[PDB]
């Protein structure tokens, strides 16, 4: 965990965690308004 969190690049723990927050690429990275893909209440929540 120490090594992973000290890492900063695309392998960084910070980015692997920010998948579930900001910055946002959801639904598509190119959109006027962006959200997070934390699919809540939908039928793909356990899958994700």
């Amino acid at each position: 965990l120490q090594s992973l969190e000290d890492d900063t690049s695309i392998n960084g723990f910070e980015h692997i965690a920010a998948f579930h927050g900001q910055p946002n690429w959801c639904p598509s990275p190119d959109a006027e308004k962006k959200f997070a893909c934390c699919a809540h209440g939908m039928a793909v929540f356990p899958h994700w």
Binding site: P23, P29, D30, A31, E32
Partner: protein, 48 residues
């Protein structure tokens, strides 16, 4: 358009000739929204 095998007159033609899909890619990879830039246009140029 020549390798696409579409003659220039086909642009004027009442048939729907084609369109273009543009997209902007940032240096760091985070593609910007297409709204940040205007709509490209197609110009014609006759012979002299």
């Amino acid at each position: 358009l020549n390798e696409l095998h579409i003659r220039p007159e086909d642009v004027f033609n009442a048939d729907a000739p084609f369109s273009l899909r543009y997209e902007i890619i940032a240096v760091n990879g985070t593609a910007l929204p297409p709204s940040s830039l205007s709509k490209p246009t197609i110009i014609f140029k006759p012979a002299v």
